[PDB]
Design an enzyme around this catalytic site. Structure first.
Site, PDB file in Angstrom:
ATOM      1  N   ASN A 171     -31.871   0.228  16.750  1.00  0.00           N
ATOM      2  CA  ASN A 171     -31.192   1.224  15.730  1.00  0.00           C
ATOM      3  C   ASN A 171     -31.298   2.535  16.190  1.00  0.00           C
ATOM      4  O   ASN A 171     -30.140   3.302  16.512  1.00  0.00           O
ATOM      5  CB  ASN A 171     -31.754   1.025  14.409  1.00  0.00           C
ATOM      6  CG  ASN A 171     -31.215  -0.107  13.602  1.00  0.00           C
ATOM      7  OD1 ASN A 171     -29.979  -0.350  13.115  1.00  0.00           O
ATOM      8  ND2 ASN A 171     -32.208  -1.055  13.314  1.00  0.00           N
ATOM      9  N   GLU A 211     -31.212 -13.863   0.439  1.00  0.00           N
ATOM     10  CA  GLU A 211     -31.095 -12.915  -0.602  1.00  0.00           C
ATOM     11  C   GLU A 211     -29.813 -12.857  -1.258  1.00  0.00           C
ATOM     12  O   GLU A 211     -28.873 -12.748  -0.525  1.00  0.00           O
ATOM     13  CB  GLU A 211     -31.560 -11.504  -0.017  1.00  0.00           C
ATOM     14  CG  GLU A 211     -32.801 -11.372   1.010  1.00  0.00           C
ATOM     15  CD  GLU A 211     -32.759 -10.149   1.779  1.00  0.00           C
ATOM     16  OE1 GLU A 211     -31.701  -9.531   1.839  1.00  0.00           O
ATOM     17  OE2 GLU A 211     -33.718  -9.870   2.502  1.00  0.00           O
ATOM     18  N   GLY A 249     -37.353 -12.029   7.671  1.00  0.00           N
ATOM     19  CA  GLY A 249     -37.752 -13.324   7.389  1.00  0.00           C
ATOM     20  C   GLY A 249     -36.483 -14.358   7.777  1.00  0.00           C
ATOM     21  O   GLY A 249     -36.708 -15.367   8.328  1.00  0.00           O
ATOM     22  N   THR A 250     -35.462 -13.977   7.193  1.00  0.00           N
ATOM     23  CA  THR A 250     -34.297 -14.561   7.305  1.00  0.00           C
ATOM     24  C   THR A 250     -33.832 -14.861   8.828  1.00  0.00           C
ATOM     25  O   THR A 250     -33.794 -15.762   9.336  1.00  0.00           O
ATOM     26  CB  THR A 250     -33.056 -14.134   6.502  1.00  0.00           C
ATOM     27  OG1 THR A 250     -33.692 -14.235   4.968  1.00  0.00           O
ATOM     28  CG2 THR A 250     -31.720 -15.017   6.723  1.00  0.00           C
ATOM     29  N   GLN A 290     -29.596  -9.807   6.408  1.00  0.00           N
ATOM     30  CA  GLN A 290     -28.598  -9.100   5.634  1.00  0.00           C
ATOM     31  C   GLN A 290     -28.164  -7.867   6.586  1.00  0.00           C
ATOM     32  O   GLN A 290     -26.774  -7.630   6.516  1.00  0.00           O
ATOM     33  CB  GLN A 290     -29.796  -8.027   4.895  1.00  0.00           C
ATOM     34  CG  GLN A 290     -28.965  -6.793   4.342  1.00  0.00           C
ATOM     35  CD  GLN A 290     -30.134  -5.969   3.399  1.00  0.00           C
ATOM     36  OE1 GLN A 290     -31.126  -6.242   3.380  1.00  0.00           O
ATOM     37  NE2 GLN A 290     -29.291  -4.989   2.587  1.00  0.00           N
ATOM     38  N   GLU A 312     -17.034 -17.899  32.465  1.00  0.00           N
ATOM     39  CA  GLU A 312     -17.268 -17.274  33.747  1.00  0.00           C
ATOM     40  C   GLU A 312     -18.034 -15.835  33.324  1.00  0.00           C
ATOM     41  O   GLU A 312     -18.316 -15.130  34.168  1.00  0.00           O
ATOM     42  CB  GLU A 312     -15.901 -16.829  34.033  1.00  0.00           C
ATOM     43  CG  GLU A 312     -15.098 -18.121  34.679  1.00  0.00           C
ATOM     44  CD  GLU A 312     -15.620 -18.756  35.561  1.00  0.00           C
ATOM     45  OE1 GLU A 312     -16.167 -18.362  36.563  1.00  0.00           O
ATOM     46  OE2 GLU A 312     -15.919 -20.265  35.379  1.00  0.00           O
ATOM     47  N   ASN A 363     -22.849   0.198  12.225  1.00  0.00           N
ATOM     48  CA  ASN A 363     -21.997  -1.231  12.145  1.00  0.00           C
ATOM     49  C   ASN A 363     -20.609  -1.044  12.587  1.00  0.00           C
ATOM     50  O   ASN A 363     -20.192  -2.273  13.296  1.00  0.00           O
ATOM     51  CB  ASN A 363     -21.974  -1.757  10.563  1.00  0.00           C
ATOM     52  CG  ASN A 363     -23.525  -1.942  10.055  1.00  0.00           C
ATOM     53  OD1 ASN A 363     -24.442  -2.100  10.765  1.00  0.00           O
ATOM     54  ND2 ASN A 363     -23.633  -2.323   8.966  1.00  0.00           N
ATOM     55  N   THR A 401     -39.038  -0.271   9.992  1.00  0.00           N
ATOM     56  CA  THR A 401     -38.948  -0.319   8.586  1.00  0.00           C
ATOM     57  C   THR A 401     -39.892  -1.471   8.160  1.00  0.00           C
ATOM     58  O   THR A 401     -39.775  -1.985   6.840  1.00  0.00           O
ATOM     59  CB  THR A 401     -37.557  -0.050   7.925  1.00  0.00           C
ATOM     60  OG1 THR A 401     -36.889   0.708   8.475  1.00  0.00           O
ATOM     61  CG2 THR A 401     -37.656   0.182   6.428  1.00  0.00           C
TER      62      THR A 401
END
Ligand SMILES: CC(=O)O[C@H]1C(=O)[C@@]2(C)[C@H]([C@H](OC(=O)c3ccccc3)[C@]3(O)C[C@H](OC(=O)[C@H](O)[C@@H](NC(=O)c4ccccc4)c4ccccc4)C(C)=C1C3(C)C)[C@]1(OC(C)=O)CO[C@@H]1C[C@@H]2O
Ligand SMILES: Nc1nc2c(ncn2[C@@H]2O[C@H](COP(=O)(O)OP(=O)(O)OP(=O)(O)O)[C@@H](O)[C@H]2O)c(=O)[nH]1
Ligand SMILES: Nc1nc2c(ncn2[C@@H]2O[C@H](COP(=O)(O)OP(=O)(O)O)[C@@H](O)[C@H]2O)c(=O)[nH]1
Ligand SMILES: [Mg+2]
Lengths: 428, 619, 61, 428, 187, 86
Positions: D198, D63, D136-137, D11, D246, D220, D171
């Site tokens: 984060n 997901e 998990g992903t 995600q 390089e 982001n 989290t």
């Protein structure tokens, strides 16, 4: 995808299910006629998690309504939201439950499960990717406890990989509307521990206080209590239904909350909760929603958190907010009340967040906590059981269904083993 | 002085259930506005007579039989009493002003005898009170129950009993003669939980019909109040029954919350298959109107059928002529009105015959000589702000609460372009150059920007003019090249736009709402919170200083016309400064005012959801 | 196969109560209380009924 | 000739991608509908037979609830749907479910999407991964994928921008588990791996841009700026052009040691941009500030094994030579003996482009500092601690052993970290 | 349709278990009926189609004509119950040359007769449940001496109970098949 | 990935190949509206709905939640050192 099938056992379970299906039917904006009349597209993107399509653009719930004594099933059919259920999603029998867990789980349960399993299989296969199940018990009555567990055991040996929820309403510690209630509680627990993955426990007594102090309700009828159970039951799944900056499927809530297979009895709370007056003055910010949820009053179970420490907890927000605030709030709480958590678990809260809030509100949240405070609840029952079982009171009814005494002794010992495990991880 | 003829007023109180009324055997249509009642001619769609005696907003409306005086409820603030007001007819002035129902008024009705008037408290303080009409005093009072009632109705005969329905309760109350009490009798329905919304009584008190959110139309006997028949067979109303009425022939008009308007003939019928059983109500005629139906009133034409005035939640008024002879039901759309909170006004340059109104749902277009709105360009969810016409006669610009500007045309076809992320959130003011070559956008997060616009290629330049607060208004000299940006900090800034270097002008005493040039002069007129119509100098000065929101000027600086939070409209001899020709009766916070360049007409519009037209005379 | 004794009562209840469906109109003439014996009618069941169409409604060729 | 394949797993990966591929179409004028009104975009696009430019990326996830948002967002006309992969079920924060049970069945799919995408590229510079450790992903699947990559290419370069589990803000409750497992497997496969977290970026938005309500969308946008300035020389001109080869040879002296921090400067809003001049000396000092880092590490607790600078905008090579001389003079900054040099710099003449609705402001200069410091081993020691802090209780292990894993991998993932930790100490 | 997709090991076109199995299929019934019932042998849902006049009650795989089902997997496997009635099904094929052959298999036929555009052939169904596999690439070579390119349309007529329709790309064994792509008949 | 998503992707591919022509997703009586307006200009007798024309657009989903205000009052919170937020 992620579709979920929903079961309702017992009278209460069939009643709160009438609200859960009425609240959600309004969330996604469908009518009592079953037709959709919302406005956005988010009403339709993940609608399939709760409904099956119908001819003529109707939506019917993926629900099953099991209860003996079909008198109750006329009520829910006659309610303003009874016309959406498929009248063949109704399994019942003329004979009564009688609050005898035995007949609900030995004689008159075995007569219906073959029909129910036929119905659940039919719409288990109506889902592209069935996520899991969820039920609505009442550990006092014989239908909820007796039939529910027998059904659950059947599902487990048929869909092992899937996950089973349980919104079981526990008996009250102070209030006992029935008399054989502890017998129905302990006997059911001997089934749930090995045959479930998550088991919310809720008590109407705490639901009365929440409606009394916070909501300032004068006369909380059972509808209002059911109106609260409906509120939270929707809050668990908004990830599966709505977009979210940090979505939380039910399987990832599991792994983040039950470090050991047996410690799967949770403790739930909802927020914001105010009266009509306080609604004018209170402001809706992340701080308000997290102090209210972390309070020992919002816990709808008859357990005191301060008598235990949170093995793990989890908060779910819905409403356009800032993820940083919710990230530090769960940090501060984890810092100050360092006695209310454990040491071998560094960070023991998960803060999911959704993008779409409830219908008329703008910010909301839901609290779920796996504390060792719940061990109190089982301690209490284990006395009322061993009180009368020491005298063999009311036990002749239970021998009347081919049962024995070993079934009780094994059942009680299962709780004493269980509550023992809640003490080990509570180092006071 | 107050000479200002009110030529036209377009508006309608949409969601006021049962708000629409027709004068019994009269030539007037009665319906509410923002805070007033309006009596239009039944035929001449100009003769309006308005009644303004409420402070906040009319909430309920009841009209006694025999064209006698009518009662009007009112909503108020949190902890201040409501105000039921009885308005005389044949004189059209106030008679009584009664005060209770601390939150709002929920329902009112006259008895068949015009001597009794029953009221129903709001969500809180929900009680049933009776009033005398000679003495504006409460005779009887009683709280119904926890499940708050919704509607109440006097019996057509025996003006001594009245039925009231609500959430999960129905009752019939009879006023005792020995005391100041009234005794209720509850309704007994077989295991039925229905949220009754509308209730009607037949002519002879036989059967009470009651709509339902489920969609049923339960008809019950009234000798004993028990239930008789469920509702429309062969289906079920979609959004629940909302607006129900009775046609004198014994049948019922039913209008659901989707626009389904149908006729159910309610005569107790035996079930064909099972003789000792009744059928459900069939449906003679049916139709679809636009929007949820909220109010139904009758007009006996008697030639073929009956004409029912139907007010829908979308502020549309329909004339539904139904004749049961051939069971034919035809509807007509008499009048339309905006929904709520008309945001922006716009006049096409050098055109004083058509104008455009940006509202909170979509853009509507109207013209001068008649209402007769031309089109409604719809955008579903997010609302429009500061509609604008590109100069010299061109596209329509509209900036939305999304933070995006979009362009439409005359027929407006398909979106000419979408300048997306034009500001952070909720672009608030929009202006164009005199050459239609650049577009200014002042957003709500205190920023100003300008976009260069070619013929088919758009240019997204990075002006990023930083301002101190939300930009209420933006103006530009049609003569040369300049810019003025007002603010919710009042610091109106003169931008040059040749170098984009913020010509250092600043005006700080309060925060402003509307600024206007004097045509072909170095003057300025600004309006903000405090009453200030100060004339400035473009050369960093203040010629003179004399709650206001909107300003406008004529071709030359003859008559500065102004309005604001006060419900009036002030016209000013600009050079002299006197408030000649002041107009009243705009029930709400007026938002915009226009001058109709070629002609002498002042259009006023405010948050009430209505539009007003006046003439223009200056000494 | 499946039994026929149990299914019938639950079906009749599901049809008549839950849905708005009809019994439909089971004639109970001659049958009073559970005590009084009924008066058996001479008619027979599954009997083909004569044609009731009028004389004249028959079109002519 | 010079193009890159940008993958987005999980995600956070595809979220950040929704900002990078937002920035690039603006950096090159590409409208949201694929087409603008050479080699300036080929690195990040591939002109179709006529008009449209498809972004040479891959959006992968288990997901569905977030990929389907790009599928309906404004940026659907850009992506051919054959790029955006989804899945009926997710990993649910379990490394095993991402790496063993579910991830095994869709790698063959994506591997063909890559094979259908590498062939279009003539000169394949290298892949560009966006892993988000802690799920998990990102962890389970992303690690399974890179194994399948090194067996195909091997000689090719696999980069990585892995968000790391922050020490304080976190989290997830189990993420110390999967994080260790991911690194134990990705290390011997990837060749260079940028690290960040984060909270280190949360503060930067508070210190520098001064926004009290930062959301995942704000961070982001800042990750978008880091990469653009990194890859500009691949697509723009400028003195001292830098290429991945390089870029890689002179930054990872030892095969095991390849992790590194990051930084960026200037970071200021619009109003703070007018009361400044932003000399090249200012930026290189702000860039070297331990508070301007993107990872919660203390560089002064270690030395710099090597450093790298990619300037942008209006610079001349002499001042960098001057400013870097000033940096080597200060004493707060340390360097290990066996590296006298350590500054491989670079310039481009294209300024940084700002996005409307963004938090940064327009600047004619910018610096992105990347450096491999031995100080980073402290944050590895945290995860080094929390793992055994919970593995001592064998908490949550029933999920992993229940999902095609065993205890061996934990112990074997354990030893690799202790071995890796000592390596950071062998350099001194 | 099904072009520019990914077919490597399996491709399931129809599955009785799902929210809506006839997503892409067109259904035409004249004197018959289609429904989904729970089978007894394989205790799950099976989509059954029945009715008189076999040649009229069927379902076509592409929703409408002029739209092809581009699929290049050689083997095609159906899972059907044998109701001891007239059952037939047809599959259209594109050869290496641009010519659309079509083969059909019927249980009420006894002789195979190759024709320019058609090849009818008998099918010897077993009793009850059975899976039938077509090479569909040996067939084109054996009939017309050409090569298989890609299927275009599939069509299944009345008097059968469908559970699975999938292309296999090779003859997998009972072991190699996943759980969903096999016949697990319970007790 | 699966049958349903492959059908989904094919439909989306068709949507992208076709030009959306900035369409309005609903077409009302265009020339009838024009003709009725011309009839009103001179004949001065037209039905109201005949004069009307209606056009809709997509707008957006997400039905106008109220703003969060993204910012407190500048008397409560200060930056790090005394200083407003922007
Ligand atoms: C002006 C205004 O905002 O009124 C509110 C309101 O004042 C309050 C008091 C509401 C109100 O709730 C109650 O009065 C209440 C009574 C008994 C038991 C529980 C609630 C409200 O009914 C609740 C209702 O909230 C919702 O609609 C929620 O989205 C909620 N809806 C329902 O449960 C529901 C379902 C079917 C039919 C009607 C309501 C919900 C919650 C979770 C998931 C989905 C939906 C709203 C906005 C209000 C009123 C009307 C006063 C509160 O309830 C909720 C859940 O919002 C009570 O505490 C909250 C705080 C709200 O401010
Ligand atoms: N900087 C940034 N971090 C994010 C963002 N979204 C999520 N993260 C973090 O990434 C981690 C989880 O990423 P996910 O992709 O949801 O996890 P996963 O790899 O998909 O594994 P599963 O949840 O089991 O499917 C958490 O630490 C998030 O806080 C984002 O938008 N920006
Ligand atoms: N929230 C709520 N709880 C109820 C309600 N009715 C009963 N309960 C509780 O549910 C328990 C009885 O379970 P019940 O289903 O009636 O008996 P059973 O049929 O043998 O399972 C009692 O503890 C009741 O107090 C209700 O309407 N709302
Ligand atoms: Mg994830």
């Amino acid at each position: 995808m992620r579709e979920i099938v929903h079961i309702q056992g017992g009278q209460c379970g069939n009643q709160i299910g009438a609200k859960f299906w009425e609240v959600v039917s309004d969330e996604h904006g469908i009518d009592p006629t079953g037709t959709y009349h919302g406005d956005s597209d988010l009403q339709l993107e993940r609608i399939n998690v709760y409904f099956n399509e119908a001819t003529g653009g109707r939506y019917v719930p993926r629900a099953i309504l099991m209860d003996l004594e079909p008198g109750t099933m006329d009520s829910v059919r006659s309610g303003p939201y009874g016309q959406i259920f498929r009248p063949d999603n109704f399994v019942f029998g003329q004979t009564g439950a009688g609050n005898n867990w035995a007949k609900g789980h030995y004689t008159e349960g075995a007569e219906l499960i073959d029909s129910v399993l036929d119905v659940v299989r039919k719409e288990a296969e109506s889902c592209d990717c069935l996520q899991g199940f969820q039920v609505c018990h009442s550990l006092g009555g014989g239908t909820g406890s007796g039939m529910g567990t027998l059904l659950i055991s059947k599902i487990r040996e048929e869909y092992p990989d899937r996950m089973m929820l349980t919104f079981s309403v526990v008996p009250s510690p102070k209030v006992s509307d029935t008399v054989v209630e502890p017998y129905n509680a302990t006997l059911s627990v001997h089934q749930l521990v090995e045959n479930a993955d998550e088991c919310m426990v809720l008590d109407n007594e705490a639901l009365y206080d929440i409606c009394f102090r916070t909501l300032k309700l004068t006369t909380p009828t059972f509808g209002d209590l059911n109106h609260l159970i409906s509120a939270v039951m929707s809050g668990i799944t908004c990830c599966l239904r709505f977009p979210g900056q940090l979505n939380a499927d039910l399987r990832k809530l599991a792994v983040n909350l039950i470090p050991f297979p047996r410690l799967h009895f949770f403790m739930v709370g909802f927020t914001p909760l105010t009266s009509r007056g306080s609604q004018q003055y209170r402001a809706l910010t992340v701080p308000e929603l997290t102090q209210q949820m972390w309070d020992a009053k919002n816990m709808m179970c008859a357990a005191d958190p301060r008598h235990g420490r949170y093995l793990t907890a989890s908060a779910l927000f819905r409403g356009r907010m800032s993820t940083k605030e919710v990230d530090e709030q769960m940090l501060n709480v984890q810092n100050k009340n360092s006695s209310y958590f454990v040491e071998w678990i560094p960070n023991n809260v998960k803060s999911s967040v959704c993008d779409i809030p409830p219908k008329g509100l703008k910010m909301s949240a839901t609290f779920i906590g796996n504390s060792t405070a719940i061990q109190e609840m089982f301690k209490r029952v284990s006395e009322q059981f061993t009180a009368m079982f020491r005298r063999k009171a009311f036990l002749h009814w239970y021998t009347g269904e081919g049962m024995d005494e070993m079934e009780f002794t094994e059942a009680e010992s299962n709780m004493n083993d269980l509550v023992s495990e809640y003490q080990q991880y509570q180092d006071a | 002085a107050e000479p200002l003829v009110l030529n036209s007023v377009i508006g309608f109180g949409g969601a006021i259930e049962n708000g629409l009324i027709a004068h019994p055997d009269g030539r007037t249509i009665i319906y509410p506005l923002g805070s007033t009642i309006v009596l239009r001619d039944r035929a001449d769609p100009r003769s309006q007579e308005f009644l303004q005696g409420h402070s906040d907003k009319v909430s309920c409306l009841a009209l006694s039989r025999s064209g006698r005086y009518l009662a009007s409820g009112q909503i108020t603030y949190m902890g201040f009493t409501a105000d039921i007001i009885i308005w005389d007819l044949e004189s059209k002035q106030l008679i009584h002003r009664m005060a209770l129902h601390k939150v709002k008024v929920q329902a009112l009705d006259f008895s068949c005898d015009e001597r009794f008037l029953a009221s129903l408290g709001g969500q809180d303080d929900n009680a049933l009170v009776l009033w005398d009409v000679a003495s504006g005093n409460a005779i009887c009072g009683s709280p119904c129950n926890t499940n708050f009632t919704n509607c109440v109705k006097f019996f057509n005969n025996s003006p001594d009993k009245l039925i009231t329905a609500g959430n999960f309760n129905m009752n019939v109350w009879t006023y005792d003669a020995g005391n100041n009490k009234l005794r209720p009798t509850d309704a007994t329905l077989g295991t039925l939980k229905r949220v009754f919304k509308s209730v009607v009584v037949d002519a002879n008190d036989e059967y009470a019909y009651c709509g339902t959110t489920t969609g049923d139309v339960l008809q019950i006997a009234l000798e004993r109040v028990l239930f008789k028949n469920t509702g429309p067979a062969k289906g079920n109303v979609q959004m629940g029954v909302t607006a129900t009425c009775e046609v004198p022939t014994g049948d019922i008009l039913v209008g659901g919350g989707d626009g389904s308007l149908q006729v159910l003939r309610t005569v107790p019928e035996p079930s064909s298959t099972n003789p000792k059983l009744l059928r459900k109500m069939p449906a003679l005629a049916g139709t679809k109107v636009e929007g949820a139906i909220t109010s139904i009133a009758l007009a006996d034409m008697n030639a073929r059928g009956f004409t029912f005035f139907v007010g829908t939640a979308m502020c549309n008024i329909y004339k539904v002529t139904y004749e049961p002879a051939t069971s034919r039901l035809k509807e007509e759309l008499v009048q339309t009105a905006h929904n709520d909170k008309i945001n922006g006004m716009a006049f096409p340059n050098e055109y004083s015959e058509v104008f455009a109104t940006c509202g909170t749902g979509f853009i509507r277009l109207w013209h001068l000589t008649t209402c007769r709105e031309l089109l409604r360009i719809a955008v579903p969810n997010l609302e429009c702000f500061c509609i604008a016409f590109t100069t010299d006669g061109s596209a329509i610009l509209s900036g939305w609460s999304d933070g995006k500007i979009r362009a439409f045309g005359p027929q407006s076809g398909k979106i000419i372009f979408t300048i997306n992320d034009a500001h952070q959130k909720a672009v608030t003011a929009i202006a164009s150059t005199a050459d239609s070559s650049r577009i200014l956008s002042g957003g709500e997060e205190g920023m100003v920007r300008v976009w260069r616009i070619g013929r088919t290629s758009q240019t997204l330049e990075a002006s990023m003019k930083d301002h101190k607060g939300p930009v209420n208004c933006i103006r530009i000299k049609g003569s040369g090249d300049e810019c003025v940006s007002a603010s919710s900090d009042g610091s109106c800034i003169l931008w040059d736009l040749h170098t984009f270097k913020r010509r250092t002008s600043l005006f700080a005493n309060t925060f402003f709402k509307s600024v206007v040039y004097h045509p072909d002069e170095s003057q300025l007129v600004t309006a903000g919170t405090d009453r200030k119509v100060t004339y400035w100098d473009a050369y960093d000065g203040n010629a003179i200083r004399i709650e206001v929101n909107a300003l406008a000027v004529d071709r030359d600086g003859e008559a500065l016309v102004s309005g604001g939070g006060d419900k009036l409209v002030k016209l000013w001899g600009y050079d002299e400064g006197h408030c000649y020709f002041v107009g009243v009766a705009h029930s709400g916070a007026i938002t915009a005012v226009g001058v109709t360049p070629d002609k002498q007409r002042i259009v006023s519009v405010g948050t009430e959801g209505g539009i007003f037209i006046w003439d223009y005379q200056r000494p | 196969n499946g039994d026929v004794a149990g299914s019938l009562f639950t079906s009749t209840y599901r049809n008549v109560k839950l849905a708005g469906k009809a019994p439909p109109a089971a004639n109970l003439s001659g049958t009073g209380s559970c005590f009084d014996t009924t008066s058996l009618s001479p008619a027979r069941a599954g009997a083909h009924k004569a044609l009731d169409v009028q004389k004249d409604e028959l079109p002519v060729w | 000739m010079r193009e890159v394949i940008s993958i987005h797993i999980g995600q956070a990966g595809i979220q950040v991608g929704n900002a990078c591929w937002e920035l690039y179409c603006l950096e090159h004028g590409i409208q949201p509908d694929g087409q603008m009104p050479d080699d300036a975009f080929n690195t990040f696009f591939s002109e179709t037979g006529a008009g449209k430019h498809v972004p040479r990326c891959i959006f992968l996830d288990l997901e569905p609830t977030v990929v389907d948002e790009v599928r309906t967002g404004t940026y659907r006309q850009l992506f051919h749907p054959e790029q955006l992969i989804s899945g009926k079920e997710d990993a649910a924060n379990n490394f095993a479910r991402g790496h063993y049970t579910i991830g095994k069945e869709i790698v063959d799919l994506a591997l063909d999407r890559i094979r259908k995408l590498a062939d279009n590229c003539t000169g394949l510079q290298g892949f560009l991964v966006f892993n988000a450790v802690g799920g998990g992903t990102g962890s389970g699947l992303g690690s399974l994928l890179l194994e399948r990559l090194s067996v195909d290419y091997g000689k090719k370069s696999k980069l990585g921008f892995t968000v790391y589990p922050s020490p304080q803000v976190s989290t997830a409750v189990v993420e110390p588990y999967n994080s260790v497992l991911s690194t134990h497997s990705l290390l011997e496969h990837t060749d260079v791996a940028v690290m960040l977290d984060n909270e280190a970026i949360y503060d930067i938005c508070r210190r520098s841009l001064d926004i009290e309500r930062p959301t995942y969308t704000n961070l982001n946008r800042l990750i978008a700026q880091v990469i653009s300035s990194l890859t500009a020389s691949l697509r723009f001109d400028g003195a001292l052009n830098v290429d991945i080869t390089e870029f890689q040879t002179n930054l990872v002296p030892y095969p095991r040691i390849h992790f590194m921090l990051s930084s960026y400067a200037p970071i200021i809003s619009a109003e703070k941009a007018y009361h400044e001049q932003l000399s090249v000396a200012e930026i290189t000092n702000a860039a070297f500030e331990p508070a301007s880092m993107m990872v919660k590490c203390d560089p002064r607790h270690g030395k710099y094994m090597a450093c790298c600078l990619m300037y942008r905008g209006d610079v001349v090579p002499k001042d960098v030579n001057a400013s870097v001389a000033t940096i080597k003079t200060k004493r707060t900054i340390q360097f290990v003996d066996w590296c006298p040099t350590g500054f491989k710099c670079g310039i481009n003449y294209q300024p940084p482009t700002v996005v409307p609705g963004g938090d940064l402001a327009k600047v004619q200069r910018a610096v992105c500092m990347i450096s491999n410091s031995t100080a980073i081993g402290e944050i590895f020691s945290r995860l080094d601690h929390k793992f055994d802090l919970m593995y001592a209780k064998r908490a949550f292990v029933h999920w992993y052993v229940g999902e095609g894993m065993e205890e061996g991998e934990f112990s074997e993932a354990r030893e690799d970290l202790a071995a890796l930790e000592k390596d950071f100490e062998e350099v001194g | 349709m099904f072009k520019n997709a990914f077919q490597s090991g399996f491709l399931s076109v129809l599955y009785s278990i799902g929210s809506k199995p006839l997503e892409i299929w067109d259904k035409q019934v004249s004197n018959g009926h289609i429904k989904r019932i729970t089978d007894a042998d394989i205790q799950s849902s099976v989509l059954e189609i029945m009715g008189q006049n076999v040649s009229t009650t069927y379902i076509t795989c592409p929703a409408d004509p002029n739209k092809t089902l581009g699929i290049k997997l050689p083997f095609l496997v159906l899972i059907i119950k044998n109701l001891n009635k007239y059952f037939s099904f047809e599959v259209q094929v594109l050869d290496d040359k641009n010519v659309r052959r079509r083969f059909r298999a019927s249980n009420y036929q006894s002789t195979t007769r190759v024709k320019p555009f058609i090849c009818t052939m008998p099918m010897r169904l077993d009793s009850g449940w059975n899976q039938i596999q077509f090479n569909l690439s040996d067939f084109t070579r054996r009939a017309y001496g050409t090569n298989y390119i890609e299927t275009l349309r599939v069509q299944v007529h009345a008097n059968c109970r469908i559970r699975r329709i999938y292309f296999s790309d090779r003859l997998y064994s009972e072991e190699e098949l996943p759980a969903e792509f096999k016949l697990f008949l319970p007790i | 990935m699966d049958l349903k998503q492959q059908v989904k992707n094919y439909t989306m591919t068709i949507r992208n190949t076709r030009p959306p022509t900035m369409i309005k997703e609903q077409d009302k009586s265009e020339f009838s509206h024009f003709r009725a307006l011309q009839v009103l200009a001179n004949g001065d007798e037209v039905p109201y709905e005949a004069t009307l024309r209606n056009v809709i657009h997509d707008g957006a989903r997400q039905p106008k939640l109220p703003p969060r205000q993204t910012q407190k009052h500048p008397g409560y919170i200060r930056n790090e050192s005394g200083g407003f937020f922007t």
